[PDB]
Amino acid sequence: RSNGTVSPSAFLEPFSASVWVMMFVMLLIVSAIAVFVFEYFTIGKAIWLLWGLVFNNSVPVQNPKGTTSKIMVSVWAFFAVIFLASYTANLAAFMIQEEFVDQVTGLSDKKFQRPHDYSPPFRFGTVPNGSTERNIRNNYPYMHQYMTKFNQKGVEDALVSLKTGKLDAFIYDAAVLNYKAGRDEGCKLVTIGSGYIFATTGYGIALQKGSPWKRQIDLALLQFVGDGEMEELETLWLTGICHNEKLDIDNMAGVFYMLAAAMALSLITFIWEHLF
């Protein structure tokens, strides 16, 4: 990613649901029942009070009548403050969580077929005379056609160039890339695949074509796997540095658009009322 990725989660709010709306409906019903009980112009004043006594009380809708009205107002205020405290706690918990899974997570979804039709030449930094290049050539030649554009050097030089210079995407061995991302300075480089692999095939020790060693070596390797050696071997050798260890202006675009739409609807309603 070019810079920090932050999700406003405007559509992930519990709004437009049947929980907060249900609680508001129940509170409104209770307030209406209390007003009807205390009753034994007024409807507009009650509606204005209910609208005001929800979020901010800095609006003149005051119309006190008696002790029952005071009691119902106090009950509504207590319910509202409890709901606001719960919502603030939920918002803090949401801010605690982070969502930085990946960017694309796909090898042949839309982009890696013909970049000329998309415009931006995403970096295709493979390496010549290897094992990944032959597979990518034998799978679909279209990607191999553009692979000749960006092919600089081994893992270190290509990673250094892609860090800030000219390259964006890098496709290479999974284990090498996992190690390189584990040992990245500042943890600013992450493989965007959510730990997904394409053509899983293990390594091996290439023996001869009939030498009397294959059976013994294979049995010894399986014995080593069973007895618990390679896990400590990798946790002592193959382990990353951080890897596993883990009021925005742009976040206000959705709520501002909703407020503008509400203002437009209010203006339309005012025009309709003035028509009659």
Binding site: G52, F55, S58, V59, V255
Partner: protein, 328 residues
């Protein structure tokens, strides 16, 4: 420690041990770590202390300011909120068409605090005011949540958990940690070869003495230091400006080195034990090594002076108002 002679394959002892071996002394009463390499040809005694290697790092004394505006989250967000509030006030004034006085507290007072000067004309104005109040409450809740999250997330720096932390095992060009040259710590880091990168990084930056290293660390020169537990703990406790990250590793007490062929051994070590149970050593340690120990106005005064600025601005503007009513 043990070094090699110049342009030769022989081994030589320099400093304290070399001085002792060449018939120049008989006791080494001083802080001297017990090590396998040393104990080969010197008869030690029972330890009179217990300690382990420890990391010391300077501590950032200022951790908060309390005078921060909405800038840490976003200032452009505040500017956009103000612009949206002004646009909402203008739209509410347009819907009304009291008069300018109606626009005096149409939305500006409602979004600020309780004034009660609003004069609604149509139900659309009331709906717009309710929407503005809800948006203001939501913005206030978001700002409070951001402030609380920043307070919880505050002080990102944390004590490095010992030497097994990969953040120190992996070398980087941001830490120049080193120890005193030619001590027991160098020997321990030498014949423990699994993290030789740190060994080389220290070998290219090793200092000369504890006092010089501490003085340099004081003026943010070296960002870390590894040394004995007791000495560094005392230095941090007295000079209350440093911390001791980690707990312990490679624990081993001091001792009184004497030569192998000496008659004082069987009578010295025993004595130490007889002096280790009747509270003598604990009393002496209490006397000498361990005797010392160690919502602001910036959130208010820094604002109050700004309020004082209003006292030097509004009053003169009041005269302007007197001018405004003069020609009107």
């Amino acid at each position: 420690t043990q070094e090699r002679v110049n342009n030769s394959n022989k081994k030589e002892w320099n400093g304290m041990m070399g001085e002792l071996l060449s018939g120049q002394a008989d006791m080494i009463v001083a802080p001297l770590t017990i090590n396998n390499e040393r104990a080969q040809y010197i008869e030690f005694s029972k330890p009179f202390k217990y300690q382990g290697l420890t990391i010391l790092v300077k501590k950032e004394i200022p951790r908060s300011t309390l005078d921060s505006f909405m800038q840490p989250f976003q200032s452009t967000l505040w500017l956009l909120v103000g612009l949206s509030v002004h646009v909402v006030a203008v739209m509410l004034y347009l819907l009304d068409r009291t008069l300018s006085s109606a626009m005096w507290f149409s939305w500006g007072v409602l979004l600020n605090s309780g004034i009660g000067e609003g004069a609604p004309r149509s139900f659309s104005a009331r709906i717009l005011g309710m929407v503005w109040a809800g948006f203001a409450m939501i913005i206030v809740a978001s700002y409070t949540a951001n402030l609380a999250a920043f307070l919880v997330l505050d002080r990102p720096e944390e004590r490095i958990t010992g030497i097994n932390d990969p953040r120190l095992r992996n070398p980087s060009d941001k830490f120049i940690y080193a120890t005193v040259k030619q001590s027991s710590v160098d020997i321990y880091f030498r014949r423990q070869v699994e993290l030789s990168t740190m060994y080389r990084h220290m070998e290219k930056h090793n200092y000369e003495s504890a006092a010089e290293a501490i003085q340099a660390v004081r003026d943010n020169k070296l960002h870390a230091f590894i040394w004995d537990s007791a000495v560094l703990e005392f230095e941090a406790s007295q000079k209350c400006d440093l911390v001791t990250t980690g707990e312990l590793f490679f624990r081993s007490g001091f001792g009184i080195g004497m030569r192998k062929d000496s008659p004082w051994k069987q009578n010295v070590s025993l004595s130490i034990l007889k002096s280790h149970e009747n509270g003598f050593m604990e009393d002496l340690d209490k006397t000498w090594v361990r005797y010392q120990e160690c919502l602001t106005f910036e959130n208010m005064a820094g604002v109050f002076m700004l309020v004082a600025g209003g006292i030097v601005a509004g009053i003169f503007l009041i005269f302007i108002e007197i001018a405004y009513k003069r020609h009107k």
